[PDB]
Amino acid sequence: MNPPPPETSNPNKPKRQTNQLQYLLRVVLKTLWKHQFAWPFQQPVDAVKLNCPDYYKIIKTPMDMGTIKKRLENNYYWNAQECIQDFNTMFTNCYIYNKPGDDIVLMAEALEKLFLQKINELP
Ligand SMILES: Cc1noc(C)c1-c1cc(O)cc([C@@H](O)c2cccnc2)c1
């Protein structure tokens, strides 16, 4: 069974729109979103659909690009580091749950490489 997806809004959370945050959405996320390996990360893991019932028994801090996209679109973050942290959590979760020689890990590693490439050009 799946937990509630991570929050994309929090009225009592302090928010702020920075040039770095705009770049993370308009450039970083938008480009990664269109990558041939991006589709498994565009929405939370469905432990039932994927026959991975133990996923949310192992991953206690889930994250996906769909959540990050909504957070960016909702101006949920205070600075770029908060958004970058969500990306790092998404990748880390994948490497934790899956075996190093798995297709999904190869997809994550490719996206992580492109992600690191793009944040090295952060404004
Ligand atoms: C991301 C993630 N992190 O842990 C798991 C598990 C996933 C995942 C998410 C999906 O939406 C689909 C699949 C699976 O169907 C697949 C996808 C691609 C290659 N080989 C297998 C895996």
Author numbering: 43 to 165
What text appears in the publication on this structure?
The L94 residue, which is conserved across the BET family, is part of the ZA loop and is located above the 5-position methyl group of the OXFBD04 isoxazole. This placement suggests that attachment of a 5-position electrophile could locate the L94C cysteine and the electrophile proximal, allowing them to react. Simulations, performed over a 50 ns time scale showed that the calculated RMSD values for both BRD4(1)WT and BRD4(1)L94C were comparable with deviations stable and remaining below 2.5 Å for BRD4(1)L94C after equilibrium had been reached. This result suggested that the L94C mutation would not significantly disrupt the stability or structure of the protein. We therefore produced BRD4(1)L94C, which was obtained in high yields and purified to homogeneity using immobilized metal affinity chromatography (IMAC) and size exclusion chromatography (SEC). Both BRD4(1)L94C and BRD4(1)WT had the same melting temperature of 49 °C, determined using differential scanning fluorimetry (DSF), suggesting that the protein stability had not been compromised by the mutation. While there is some small variation in the ZA loop where the mutation is located (backbone alignment variation of 0.41 Å RMSD for the full protein), OXFBD04 (3) retains the key interactions with N140 and Y97 of BRD4(1)L94C. However, in the case of BRD4(1)L94C, both enantiomers were observed in the electron density map. The position of OXFBD04 (3) when bound to BRD4(1)L94C suggested that attachment of the electrophile at the 5-position of the dimethylisoxazole ring would locate the electrophile and C94 close in space. Increasing concentrations of OXFBD04 (3) also led to decreased levels of BRD4(1)L94C labeling by 42. These results are consistent with both compounds residing in the KAc binding pocket and covalently labeling BRD4(1)L94C.
BRD4, together with BRD2, BRD3 and BRDT, comprise the BET family of bromodomain-containing proteins, which function as readers of acetyl lysine (KAc) residues on histones and other proteins. Using the bromodomain-containing protein BRD4 as an example, we employed a structure-based approach to identify the L94C mutation in the first bromodomain of BRD4 [BRD4(1)] as having a minimal effect on BRD4(1) function. The aim of our work was to develop a technology that combines site-directed cysteine mutation with covalent fragments, allowing rapid elucidation of ligands to inhibit the function of the mutant protein domain. In this work, we describe a new methodology, “mutate and conjugate”, that combines site-directed mutagenesis and the use of covalent inhibitors to rapidly identify selective small molecule ligands for a protein of interest.
